[PDB]
Amino acid sequence: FLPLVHNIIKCMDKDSPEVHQDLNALKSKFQEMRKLISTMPGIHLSPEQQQQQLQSLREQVRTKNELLQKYK
């Protein structure tokens, strides 16, 4: 998903040559990508909060493992 858009943006910045009988590619390019923006895994929340959730659940994973060492 995400790496593709950077390629889509690159393609959309190298179009619209001239004016004649033409193909509505720029119109289909903002729509195609606009779907990609709606499908990004992570824009729904901030990045810092997700990273904090990682360590908080690593704390229990570490604690469980650490308490799994006293288990022996």
Partner: protein, 126 residues
């Protein structure tokens, strides 16, 4: 924010086409005709060329979430086996063998006395 930056590009392009084709559109001058709107598109591209890279890190960050939760499941899946073997462990052991201790040992001790006790009322049945 990202979606807004795109509807601007289409609207600016749509208005630009009208006044390069419709000669009577000179009076209705709006966005997508001057050089200021073109500069706004560049800034929108710059802002739009920053919010994706921030999101790419978010997706990788979210991927690290699944692997950790899998370890939590693995660290908790064995618990179902842990609880299964504790009930088995308790049932394996003969608990409260003190009753059998004071009963069996008392019978044993004396083994030399029970034999002599049973040698003198033998054939006790019909």
């Amino acid at each position: 924010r990202l979606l807004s930056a795109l509807e601007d590009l289409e609207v600016l392009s749509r208005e630009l086409i009208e006044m390069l084709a419709i000669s009577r559109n000179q009076k209705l001058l709006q966005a997508g005709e001057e050089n200021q709107v073109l500069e706004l598109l560049i800034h929108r591209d710059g802002e739009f060329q920053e919010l994706m890279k921030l999101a790419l890190n978010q997706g990788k960050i979210h991927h690290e979430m699944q692997v950790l939760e899998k370890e939590v499941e693995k660290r908790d899946s064995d618990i179902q086996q842990l609880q299964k073997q504790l009930k088995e462990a308790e049932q394996i052991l003969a608990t409260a063998v003190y009753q059998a201790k004071e009963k069996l040992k008392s019978i044993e001790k004396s083994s030399e006395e029970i034999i002599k006790y049973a040698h003198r009322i033998s054939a006790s049945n019909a």
